[PDB]
């Protein structure tokens, strides 16, 4: 039946494609042409519609496609843009859950993680070959992403930017397949140049390529490598930035058989190079990750936990920590008698001194071509290859020697966190988009106003991973409706993992050990 595609597709063309993939193709072709007209985009490539009608996927997508022949092989790099359609329902999957002696099945919709199967990709490749004529071409996966059903398609600015970013990545991957030279400390280490860095206690969120908010408590900014006394580059003005890492810190309530009860879980939510640089490679990513390490290694992250004193509406007010402590009460942090010293004491008794470094990993994110190696490095059939790629990336940064710090085959680079991440946003009182991750441990304690039993039910939902994830997802959504509100939109899900402490030691020390010295701007607190 599915093998009749061999007859169905032999000749001719048809009238088809869903309403969103149709509209999306039309706007993306318009944007391509305007970008060429303004000379922002080069006219060396093609945009294609992938149909659920003409070919074998549940979800249609547009394909950002670039090509070159590399050493005789035709190579195509594709960055799919999934187009979910609110009016189209793909048949659901049966989730059978063996609840001890009780067996029950939950049916559920396929998300981009379930949709982007290995065959989904292979079908994308085949269609491109039909559309490009390159039937013997190899196709590079730049990472599928999704442009969600919900918003109006008239945002030409964002859509233009999506094409720009997607072609950037396509050029990188053709280049890196072509053998292009890597990013390294040697390029930064001018004989007359040094690095410096600071922690930004932002007070604001940051936004992905489609404009959705990303939680961050601290933005780590690594300054441009340079030195006073160097030749000024004519009449210029520039931001002195090299890269940045977005992160936040939760306070996880963790077991112990003497440590205090909460863990300073430092979570990377995003990794970006400064906007003036176009390329996106593993070496650039890996180098930037050292920015999160310094958050607790040299500086002190705990300043981010200070309550917004004077602000009534602080949903994550530290005062909530008193509900997990022996007080079983909110600390009065509204008062003129609440001091910096009292804050430090709450933490002395409640929060552990040893930082833990972890990060999100998203196969469908803005950095998916790279996120995918870090995800496969967690485990599975190609873990060894993904790990080899990552250690090679750091060695490219330092000129070898990562191996002088530890054995990557005894110490895999990233461990699973188990509980995965539901992403989404909610609207605040003025209708702005805010990250749903705000109901973190302090957030949830204030949301239940001290009802510890309600908190613990939620907390167990977010921690006990012997419970099938569908059951956990349903309870997590039930809790958002009661505590966050009904104005909640869900977005593409993501993985989380723990960076191996030895990977971290080797990355940070190896860079410092080759002389790429970085000064702290916050010289003392």
């Amino acid at each position: 039946a599915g093998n009749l595609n061999s007859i169905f597709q032999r000749s001719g063309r048809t009238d088809g494609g869903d309403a969103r993939a149709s509209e999306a193709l039309a706007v993306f072709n318009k944007l391509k042409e305007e970008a060429i007209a303004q000379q922002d985009l080069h006219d060396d490539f093609l945009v294609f519609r992938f149909d659920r009608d003409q070919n074998r996927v549940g979800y249609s997508a547009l394909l950002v496609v670039k090509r070159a022949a590399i050493n005789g092989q035709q190579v195509i790099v594709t960055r799919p843009l999934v187009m979910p359609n609110d009016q189209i329902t793909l048949p659901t999957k049966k989730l059978t859950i063996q609840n001890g002696m009780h067996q029950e099945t939950i049916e559920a919709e396929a998300d981009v993680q379930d949709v982007f199967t290995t065959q989904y990709w292979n079908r994308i490749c085949d269609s491109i070959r039909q559309q490009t004529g390159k039937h013997d071409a190899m196709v590079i996966n730049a990472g599928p992403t999704v442009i969600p059903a919900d918003f109006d398609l008239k945002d030409e600015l964002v859509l233009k930017q999506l094409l720009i970013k997607s072609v950037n990545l396509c050029d990188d991957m053709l280049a890196k397949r072509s053998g292009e030279q890597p990013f390294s400390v040697a390029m930064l280490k001018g004989t007359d140049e040094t690095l410096a860095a600071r922690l930004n206690f932002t007070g604001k969120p940051m936004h992905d390529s489609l404009g959705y908010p990303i939680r961050s408590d601290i933005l780590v900014s690594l300054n441009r490598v340079k030195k006073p006394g160097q030749q000024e580059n004519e009449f210029y003005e520039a931001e002195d930035k090299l890269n940045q890492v977005s992160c936040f810190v939760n306070l996880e309530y963790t077991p112990q058989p003497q440590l205090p009860p909460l863990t300073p879980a430092i979570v990377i939510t995003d990794v970006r190079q400064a906007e003036w640089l176009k390329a996106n490679t593993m070496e650039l990513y890996l180098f930037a990750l050292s920015n999160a390490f310094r958050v607790t290694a040299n500086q002190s992250w705990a300043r981010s936990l200070l309550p917004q004193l004077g602000k009534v509406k602080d949903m994550r007010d530290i005062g909530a920590i008193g509900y997990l402590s022996r007080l079983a009460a909110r600390v009065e942090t509204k008062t003129e008698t609440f001091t910096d010293q009292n804050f430090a004491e709450l933490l002395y008794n409640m929060v552990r001194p040893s930082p833990v470094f972890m990060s999100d990993l998203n196969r469908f994110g803005d950095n998916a071509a790279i996120e995918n190696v870090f995800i496969d490095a967690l485990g599975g059939v190609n873990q060894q290859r993904a790990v080899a790629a990552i250690i090679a990336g750091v060695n490219n940064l330092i000129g070898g020697g990562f191996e002088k710090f530890f054995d990557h085959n005894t110490m895999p680079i990233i461990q699973p966190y188990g509980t995965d991440i539901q992403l989404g946003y909610y609207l605040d009182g003025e209708g702005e988009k805010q990250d749903r991750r705000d109901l973190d441990v302090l957030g949830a304690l204030n949301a239940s106003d001290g009802n510890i039993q309600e908190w613990m039910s939620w907390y167990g939902t977010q921690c006990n991973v012997a419970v099938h994830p569908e059951l956990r997802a349903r309870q997590s959504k039930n809790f958002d409706r009661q505590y966050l509100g009904n104005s909640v939109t869900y977005t593409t899900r993501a993985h989380r993992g723990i960076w191996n402490p030895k990977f971290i030691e080797a990355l940070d020390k190896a860079i410092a050990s080759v002389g790429l010295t970085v000064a702290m701007d916050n010289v003392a607190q």
Partner: peptide, 12 residues
């Protein structure tokens, strides 16, 4: 508990 792998490329 298990890790699925999609069709990644370039690095392998």
């Amino acid at each position: 508990p298990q890790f699925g792998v999609g069709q990644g490329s370039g690095f392998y």
